[PDB]
UniProtKB/Swiss-Prot annotation, chains A, B:
It comes from Human coronavirus NL63 (HCoV-NL63). Belongs to the alphacoronaviruses spike protein family. It comes from the Viruses. This is Spike glycoprotein. The chain holds residues 1164 to 1224 of 1356 of the full protein. S1 region attaches the virion to the cell membrane by interacting with host ACE2, initiating the infection. Binding to the receptor probably induces conformational changes in the S glycoprotein unmasking the fusion peptide and activating membranes fusion. S2 region belongs to the class I viral fusion protein. Under the current model, the protein has at least 3 conformational states: pre-fusion native state, pre-hairpin intermediate state, and post-fusion hairpin state.
Length: 61, 61
């Protein structure tokens, strides 16, 4: 996972083939080592396209 | 997939590294051999966190 100046993309480690990140690539490993990317839940969709928080949207809608 | 007395977790088979189950680990293989876990669709979220049934929630909301 890397950063092309405000745009996050995912590529391999052997060849350079960029694409966009999707939800099926992430797991959940509780408690957050320090050297991660600080981001709140509201702006998470700017990292992962095609991720809609059902909870907060049904709070709104 | 195992059970720590009402809490379901997923670990490897070589080392013991527990975490929570997510949606990207399951496939759909129709007709249900006998020795599974009997559970209805309403309480499925107690097995899989971050699984919202869109259909029944839009029936409600
Ligand atoms: C994401 O945000 C968190 C919190 O806003 C950052 O965690 C904290 O970061 C500081 C420095 O990056 C860690 O060092 C501390 O610095 C102070 C001096 O201001 C010093 O007095 C402390 O003894 C300590 O050395 C701090 O430990 C850390 N907080 C915790 C609870 O570990 C985090 O660094 C941010 N992410 C990135 C990539 O910067
Ligand atoms: C999940 O629930 C289903 C249905 O509620 C269970 O399926 C049925 O389980 C019984 C015993 O576990 C199976 O054996 C049957 O027992 C009766 C005696 O009560 C006997 O007369 C029958 O000939 C048969 O041996 C039954 O076959 C099975 N139903 C079907 C359609 O196969 C299931 O066992 C439950 N899951 C677990 C893990 O227990
Ligand atoms: C999920 O969403 C519903 C309604 O949007 C809300 O009542 C519930 O508290 C939310 N749960 C979490 C863990 O965000
Ligand atoms: C999916 O949800 C919609 C509205 O919530 C409903 O009309 C439809 O029957 C549902 N389909 C299934 C297969 O549950």
């Amino acid at each position: 996972l890397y950063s092309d100046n405000g745009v996050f993309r995912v590529t391999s480690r052997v060849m350079f083939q960029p694409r966009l990140p999707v939800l099926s690539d992430f797991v959940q490993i509780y408690n957050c080592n320090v050297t991660f990317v600080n981001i709140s839940r509201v702006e998470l969709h700017t990292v992962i396209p095609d991720y809609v928080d059902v909870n907060k949207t049904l709070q709104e809608f």
